[PDB]
Design an enzyme around this catalytic site. Structure first.
Site, PDB file in Angstrom:
ATOM      1  N   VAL A  53       0.822  -1.201   0.000  1.00 48.14           N
ATOM      2  CA  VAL A  53       0.000   0.000   0.000  1.00 48.14           C
ATOM      3  C   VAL A  53       0.860   1.257   0.000  1.00 48.14           C
ATOM      4  O   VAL A  53       1.882   1.315   0.674  1.00 48.14           O
ATOM      5  CB  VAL A  53      -0.897   0.064   1.256  1.00 48.14           C
ATOM      6  CG1 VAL A  53      -1.874   1.217   1.137  1.00 48.14           C
ATOM      7  CG2 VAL A  53      -1.621  -1.254   1.451  1.00 48.14           C
ATOM      8  N   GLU A  88      10.104  10.984  -2.100  1.00 51.19           N
ATOM      9  CA  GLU A  88       9.666  12.343  -2.390  1.00 51.19           C
ATOM     10  C   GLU A  88       8.331  12.174  -3.146  1.00 51.19           C
ATOM     11  O   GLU A  88       8.119  11.188  -3.859  1.00 51.19           O
ATOM     12  CB  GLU A  88      10.692  13.091  -3.262  1.00 51.19           C
ATOM     13  CG  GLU A  88      10.682  12.735  -4.729  1.00 51.19           C
ATOM     14  CD  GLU A  88      11.589  13.628  -5.591  1.00 51.19           C
ATOM     15  OE1 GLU A  88      11.209  14.769  -5.952  1.00 51.19           O
ATOM     16  OE2 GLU A  88      12.698  13.181  -5.915  1.00 51.19           O
ATOM     17  N   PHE A  89       7.424  13.125  -2.958  1.00 49.35           N
ATOM     18  CA  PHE A  89       6.105  13.071  -3.582  1.00 49.35           C
ATOM     19  C   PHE A  89       5.981  13.878  -4.883  1.00 49.35           C
ATOM     20  O   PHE A  89       6.480  15.008  -4.970  1.00 49.35           O
ATOM     21  CB  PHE A  89       5.059  13.599  -2.583  1.00 49.35           C
ATOM     22  CG  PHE A  89       3.660  13.613  -3.113  1.00 49.35           C
ATOM     23  CD1 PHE A  89       3.109  14.776  -3.665  1.00 49.35           C
ATOM     24  CD2 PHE A  89       2.882  12.459  -3.060  1.00 49.35           C
ATOM     25  CE1 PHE A  89       1.805  14.779  -4.148  1.00 49.35           C
ATOM     26  CE2 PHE A  89       1.579  12.452  -3.542  1.00 49.35           C
ATOM     27  CZ  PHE A  89       1.035  13.619  -4.092  1.00 49.35           C
ATOM     28  N   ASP A  98      11.514  -2.886 -13.977  1.00 47.94           N
ATOM     29  CA  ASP A  98      10.062  -2.864 -14.140  1.00 47.94           C
ATOM     30  C   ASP A  98       9.512  -1.501 -14.492  1.00 47.94           C
ATOM     31  O   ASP A  98       8.524  -1.031 -13.910  1.00 47.94           O
ATOM     32  CB  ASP A  98       9.373  -3.387 -12.880  1.00 47.94           C
ATOM     33  CG  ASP A  98       7.872  -3.566 -13.065  1.00 47.94           C
ATOM     34  OD1 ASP A  98       7.432  -3.996 -14.162  1.00 47.94           O
ATOM     35  OD2 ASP A  98       7.133  -3.289 -12.101  1.00 47.94           O
TER      36      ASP A  98
HETATM   37  N1  X85 Z   1       6.197   9.064  -5.079  1.00 53.08           N
HETATM   38  C1  X85 Z   1       4.913   9.409  -5.456  1.00 53.08           C
HETATM   39  O1  X85 Z   1       4.531  10.558  -5.330  1.00 53.08           O
HETATM   40  C2  X85 Z   1       4.091   8.314  -6.041  1.00 53.08           C
HETATM   41  C3  X85 Z   1       4.290   6.960  -5.592  1.00 53.08           C
HETATM   42  C4  X85 Z   1       3.519   5.873  -6.143  1.00 53.08           C
HETATM   43  N2  X85 Z   1       3.728   4.583  -5.687  1.00 53.08           N
HETATM   44  O2  X85 Z   1       3.053   3.649  -6.171  1.00 53.08           O
HETATM   45  O3  X85 Z   1       4.579   4.411  -4.803  1.00 53.08           O
HETATM   46  C5  X85 Z   1       2.544   6.155  -7.165  1.00 53.08           C
HETATM   47  N3  X85 Z   1       1.792   5.124  -7.729  1.00 53.08           N
HETATM   48  C6  X85 Z   1       0.342   5.142  -7.753  1.00 53.08           C
HETATM   49  C7  X85 Z   1      -0.096   5.352  -9.189  1.00 53.08           C
HETATM   50  C8  X85 Z   1      -1.593   5.576  -9.263  1.00 53.08           C
HETATM   51  N4  X85 Z   1      -1.913   5.773 -10.678  1.00 53.08           N
HETATM   52  C9  X85 Z   1      -2.951   6.909 -10.851  1.00 53.08           C
HETATM   53  C10 X85 Z   1      -3.274   7.104 -12.348  1.00 53.08           C
HETATM   54  O4  X85 Z   1      -2.479   6.090 -13.222  1.00 53.08           O
HETATM   55  C11 X85 Z   1      -2.744   4.625 -12.791  1.00 53.08           C
HETATM   56  C12 X85 Z   1      -2.415   4.437 -11.292  1.00 53.08           C
HETATM   57  C13 X85 Z   1       2.342   7.495  -7.608  1.00 53.08           C
HETATM   58  C14 X85 Z   1       3.104   8.587  -7.054  1.00 53.08           C
HETATM   59  N5  X85 Z   1       2.890   9.901  -7.494  1.00 53.08           N
HETATM   60  C15 X85 Z   1       1.905  10.273  -8.521  1.00 53.08           C
HETATM   61  C16 X85 Z   1       0.493  10.308  -7.935  1.00 53.08           C
HETATM   62  C17 X85 Z   1      -0.571   9.655  -8.625  1.00 53.08           C
HETATM   63  C18 X85 Z   1      -1.897   9.666  -8.098  1.00 53.08           C
HETATM   64  C19 X85 Z   1      -2.158  10.335  -6.874  1.00 53.08           C
HETATM   65  N6  X85 Z   1      -1.093  10.990  -6.181  1.00 53.08           N
HETATM   66  C20 X85 Z   1       0.230  10.982  -6.703  1.00 53.08           C
END
Ligand code: X85
Length: 294
Positions: free
Chosen positions: A17, A77-78, A123
């Site tokens: 998660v 980092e976000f 990946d």
């Molecule tokens: N380091 C981050 O800021 C970040 C980390 C992950 N993660 O899985 O560790 C992620 N993945 C989730 C991806 C969700 N996506 C949304 C649309 O594309 C298909 C699935 C998206 C991120 N930032 C962009 C981010 C994306 C959505 C909300 N907040 C930040």
């Protein structure tokens, strides 16, 4: 969280998660990944801890590796959006070529950096490429595959995407090289251009055959040693190669040339990130501002 205030669930990543969270003391907003079974290998923690030192403008920074209560959390980092969502949002009109070029160029710089430090991603996919309002794009999760293991399912029976997998992985090679990342990035480059996944396989064999149907079934001429690969079968159908002009229209010859080098079957012939940065396709590269709606 001991010091984190959960803002919202970003989703269920490949390793567990992921939450957008705020550090109650610093005020910093970060992405917190909870890593999934019963023990937490010390080899993994040492390996992960090393990635904290892998800092580059096009690599998502690993801020902290928290191993407490015998649990593992990764603090990154976000960034506000990922490339998969951006491509979907840009589906109607398409991402402008100058932005596609800027993103590819930045991603190659990130790969060149990681590869020079002997770190592979393994990946890469649009969902792992993060973007911000300034026109930057960064690679997320470099080195986690090696520090950990095979994907298959996130942690809640979630279909692992094979669309960006290099052919040598699909043919059962046990040793990955930097070339697997160049292959994935080439698949992403093509998808940004055409607005459709290049090889959308729904099984390992469908993935392999989709690649064969487009690039031709590999043989000893173009890929020395391919017939000795672990999962190679003499019974594979023999498809003829298609023309790139048909695969990624209306990309220009500079783009087609670079893509062709990123998709060479032989990992040893596949262009390196460093060499790709020098390709004529980047002669006019710039850094445009994307239209990002958050
Ligand atoms: N380091 C981050 O800021 C970040 C980390 C992950 N993660 O899985 O560790 C992620 N993945 C989730 C991806 C969700 N996506 C949304 C649309 O594309 C298909 C699935 C998206 C991120 N930032 C962009 C981010 C994306 C959505 C909300 N907040 C930040």
């Amino acid at each position: 969280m001991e010091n984190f205030q959960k803002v919202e669930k970003i989703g269920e990543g490949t390793y567990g998660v992921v939450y957008k969270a705020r550090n109650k003391l610093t005020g910093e907003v970060v992405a917190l990944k909870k890593i999934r079974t019963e023990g937490v290998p010390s080899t993994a923690i040492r390996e992960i801890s090393l990635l904290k030192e892998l800092n580059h403008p096009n690599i998502v920074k690993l801020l902290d590796v928290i191993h407490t209560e015998n649990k593992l959390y990764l603090v990154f980092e976000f960034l506000h959006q990922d490339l998969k969502k951006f491509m979907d949002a840009s589906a109607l009109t398409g991402i402008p070529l100058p932005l596609i070029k800027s993103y590819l160029f930045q991603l190659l710089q990130g790969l060149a950096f990681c590869h020079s430090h002997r770190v592979l991603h393994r990946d890469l996919k649009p969902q792992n490429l993060l973007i911000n309002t300034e026109g930057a794009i960064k690679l997320a999760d470099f080195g986690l595959a090696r520090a950990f293991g095979v994907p298959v399912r996130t942690y809640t029976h979630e279909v692992v995407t094979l669309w960006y997998r290099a052919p040598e992985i699909l043919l059962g090679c046990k040793y990955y090289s930097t070339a697997v990342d160049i292959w994935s990035l080439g698949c992403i480059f093509a998808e940004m251009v055409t607005r459709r996944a290049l090889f959308p396989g729904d099984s390992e064999i469908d993935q392999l055959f989709r690649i064969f149907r487009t690039l031709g079934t590999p043989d000893e001429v173009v890929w020395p040693g391919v017939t000795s690969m672990p999962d190679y079968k003499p019974s594979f159908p023999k498809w003829a190669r298609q023309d790139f002009s048909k695969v990624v229209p209306p990309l220009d010859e500079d783009g087609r040339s670079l893509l062709s080098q990123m998709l060479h079957y032989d990992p040893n012939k596949r262009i390196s990130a460093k060499a790709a940065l020098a390709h004529p396709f980047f002669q006019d590269v710039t850094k445009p501002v994307p239209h990002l709606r958050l």
